[PDB]
């Protein structure tokens, strides 16, 4: 939690529980990327909100809609387990052949 | 952290540290709202990524770009302390009169 910002047991439960980030290392051979989070319609496709990216050893909080996702990037996001499943299919596995 | 998803000390540091959410209760008299996160250009304006909203007692993870912000809503977001300051100015205080 952030020092000198309000604290409570209830807030901590949320921060630690339903808001705990998920993470997925994008495959090195994912070919449909090199495009912005905005262009990729991530929330529409998966339900996820991306909160951070690690790109070539650099961790970026709040990448925003104009950041690009490249193969190999490590994506951090909020959601639930079903969002995770959709993120796995969208970034790595790919429906169809 | 999420059970059966990968864990490490380094990941925990990130989750607990730079990714810890901030939160701000939107003022009840903020008059420029009732508009979607997308329309409000939140990242452009503030640098923030909204991860959750509490609206009239209901907490919503990953509200996404099509959710509306209304006066009184509780917004949760990632960023840094400067993002917090910009969020405070954008949602509540308002530059100018």
Residue numbers in the entry:
A (entry chain A), B (entry chain A): 117 to 213
What does the literature reporting this entry say, word for word?
BusR is a member of a yet structurally uncharacterized subfamily of the GntR family of transcription factors that downregulates transcription of the genes for the BusA (OpuA) glycine-betaine transporter upon c-di-AMP binding. BusR satisfies the overall domain architecture of the GntR family with its N-terminal winged helix-turn-helix motif (wHTH) and a C-terminal effector binding motif, an RCK_C domain (regulator of K+ conductance). Our structural data, supported by biochemical and biophysical data, reveal that BusR utilizes a unique domain assembly with a tetrameric coiled-coil in between the binding platforms, serving as a molecular ruler to specifically recognize a 22 bp separated bipartite binding motif. Binding of c-di-AMP to BusR induces a shift in equilibrium from an inactivated towards an activated state that allows BusR to bind the target DNA, leading to transcriptional repression.
We purified and crystallized a construct comprising only the RCK_C domain (Leu135 to end) and solved its ligand-free and c-di-AMP bound structure to 1 and 1.2 Å resolution, respectively. The crystal of the apo state only contains one monomer in the asymmetric unit. However, a symmetry related copy is present that generates the dimeric assembly as common to RCK_C domains and as observed in our full-length structure. The scattering data show that the RCK_C domain on its own is dimeric in solution even in the absence of c-di-AMP. The apo and c-di-AMP bound crystal structure of the RCK_C domain show that c-di-AMP binding induces a subtle rotation of the RCK_C domains that results in a widening of the binding pocket. This movement pushes residues Pro179, Gly180, Pro181 and Phe182 (chain A) further out in respect to Trp159 (chain B) of the opposing chain. Thus, it seems that this interface locks wHTHinhib in an autoinhibited state in absence of c-di-AMP, restricting movement of wHTHinhib and thus impairing high affinity binding to the operator sequence.
